[PDB]
Design a protein around this ligand. Sequence first.
Ligand SMILES: CC(C)(C)OC(=O)NCCOCCOc1ccccc1-c1nnc(Nc2ccc(CC(N)=O)cc2F)c2ccsc12
Length: 133
Amino acid sequence: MYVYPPNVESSPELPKHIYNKLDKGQIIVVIWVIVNNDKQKYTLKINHDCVPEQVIAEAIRKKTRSMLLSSEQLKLCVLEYQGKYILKVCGCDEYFLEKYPLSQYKYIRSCIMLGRMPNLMLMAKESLYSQLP
Ligand SMILES: CC(C)(C)OC(=O)NCCOCCOc1ccccc1-c1nnc(Nc2ccc(CC(N)=O)cc2F)c2ccsc12
């Protein structure tokens, strides 16, 4: 269980041809989760420069929407749960573990260029843990 550094570009600035493909600075992503090992997903529209914990936070917003939480109650729940999970590129041993604008990760910036939908798996942070020798 080696964990590799984040696969990011050298600058958060988007090249001209990629910047002009944003829809009012926003992108759409699909977030998968294992629930039986059944799968559920969210399709979320987010600012391109959201950091991975803000993506997990938006999914927390969607999950608790029916509770009619106030902004303070949502902040409390987000601070409690957003650190217990991590985002992983579907089908690849690559994680978004560090605070970078999402579009600075090479997988996301490639999805924006090619017009492809980013697919990410939200997983428990403990699955990264290696046992001690
Ligand atoms: C924020 C906390 C941690 C309190 O929310 C949970 O306990 N989540 C559930 C456990 O999954 C653990 C990880 O889940 C999350 C953790 C953080 C943010 C969002 C989720 C999340 N939750 N549900 C998702 N779909 C989903 C719909 C309906 C059901 C059936 C049902 N009647 O519950 C089950 C489902 F799974 C999806 C789909 C994509 S992300 C996501």
